[PDB]
Amino acid sequence: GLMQFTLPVRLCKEIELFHFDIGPFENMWPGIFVYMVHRSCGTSCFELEKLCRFIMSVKKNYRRVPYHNWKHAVTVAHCMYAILQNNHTLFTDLERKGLLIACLCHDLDHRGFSNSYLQKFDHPLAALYSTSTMEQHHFSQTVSILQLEGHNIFSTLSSSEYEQVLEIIRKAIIATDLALYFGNRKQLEEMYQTGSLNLNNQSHRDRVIGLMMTACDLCSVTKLWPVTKLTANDIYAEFWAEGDEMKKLGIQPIPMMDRDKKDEVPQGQLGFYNAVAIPCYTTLTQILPPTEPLLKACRDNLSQWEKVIRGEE
Numbered sequence: 418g419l420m421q422f423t424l425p426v427r428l429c430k431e432i433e434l435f436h437f438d439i440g441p442f443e444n445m446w447p448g449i450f451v452y453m454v455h456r457s458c459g460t461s462c463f464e465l466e467k468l469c470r471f472i473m474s475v476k477k478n479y480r481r482v483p484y485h486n487w488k489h490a491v492t493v494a495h496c497m498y499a500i501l502q503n504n505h506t507l508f509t510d511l512e513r514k515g516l517l518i519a520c521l522c523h524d525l526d527h528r529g530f531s532n533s534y535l536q537k538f539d540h541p542l543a544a545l546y547s548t549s550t551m552e553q554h555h556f557s558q559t560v561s562i563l564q565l566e567g568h569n570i571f572s573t574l575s576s577s578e579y580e581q582v583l584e585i586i587r588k589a590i591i592a593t594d595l596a597l598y599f600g601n602r603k604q605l606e607e608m609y610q611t612g613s614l615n616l617n618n619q620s621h622r623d624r625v626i627g628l629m630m631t632a633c634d635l636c637s638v639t640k641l642w643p644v645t646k647l648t649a650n651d652i653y654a655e656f657w658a659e660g661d662e663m664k665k666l667g668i669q670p671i672p673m674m675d676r677d678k679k680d681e682v683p684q685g686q687l688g689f690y691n692a693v694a695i696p697c698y699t700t701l702t703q704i705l706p707p708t709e710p711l712l713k714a715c716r717d718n719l720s721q722w723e724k725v726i727r728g729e730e
């Protein structure tokens with residue numbers, strides 16, 4: 418009960434900031450996640466023995482791919498932690514529990530390939546789940562790990578609390594399917610502008626939680642320029658591997674995925690910031706004003722990509 422996780426002083430302070438980087442020491446990441454659960458939720462939210470076993474099983478079920486890896490999982494959970502701490506009173510005990518676990522699990526057993534590649538490959542998961550293919554797989558994998566003996570971190574919830582938290586995690590993980598994000602933000606935009614947005618409306622909370630999941634999922638665009646720039650190499654290493662696999666199926670990939678067209682990357686990140694990231698953090702900053710640092714950081718990195726193009730780096 419009385420056993421706190423503490424971090425070194427620099428981590429203890431920087432972990433509270435949106436732009437925190439979890440660092441290159443893999444063995445500290447489980448401790449960093451537990452620390453975040455303890456401050457965001459309480460030291461009673463989860464049985465430590467079970468949580469530790471759940472974390473190590475989640476870690477084992479992430480693959481050694483350049484980007485969609487265990488480090489991405491913990492990075493996305495830390496952004497959720499920063500959003501939850503800067504918006505203390507807006508979220509329920511169930512939501513704070515559910516959302517950190519959702520973020521940690523949101524890309525479970527990812528192969529570094531998109532839903533499009535699975536469909537064109539004709540991968541069995543594409544027959545099993547016709548839309549949000551990988552995301553339905555990620556939720557399936559989360560449930561599987563929760564059902565391992567000694568892994569059910571939720572076992573002390575009432576029957577209906579358990580159903581609500583698994584329903585929060587499912588929606589949260591499905592919302593990380595970027596094809597669903599565009600319509601979700603458009604709706605949140607209309608609701609905020611016509612002033613019909615209402616956080617006591619469950620269906621409205623769902624939408625807001627989805628945008629938070631998009632916001633955390635993209636949070637590599639909200640770090641200090643060097644972090645953001647070096648992560649973009651990991652992201653493109655997956656894209657180019659997928660591009661190669663498209664060519665193997667006799668399909669010319671989109672230029673963003675073609676490793677012959679690396680020149681077109683900076684312009685590609687521009688389109689992504691303008692079409693996805695900026696609109697995402699703008700709408701988020703309108704609903705949850707304290708998340709403004711993510712928008713500011715994202716605009717800062719947009720400006721860095723403009724500089725790469727103008728040949729200034």
Ligand SMILES: COc1ccc2nc(N)c3c(C)nc(-c4ccccc4Cl)n3c2n1
Binds near residue numbers: 595636649
């Ligand atoms: C999906 O198409 C793209 C294209 C350019 C990206 N550039 C990024 N900097 C980026 C980031 C931080 N996260 C994603 C992303 C989001 C959801 C699923 C998979 C990925 Cl890779 N992307 C990008 N995604």
Ligand SMILES: [Mg+2]
Binds near residue numbers: 523524551594
């Ligand atoms: Mg994903």
Ligand SMILES: [Zn+2]
Binds near residue numbers: 493523524634
């Ligand atoms: Zn992700």
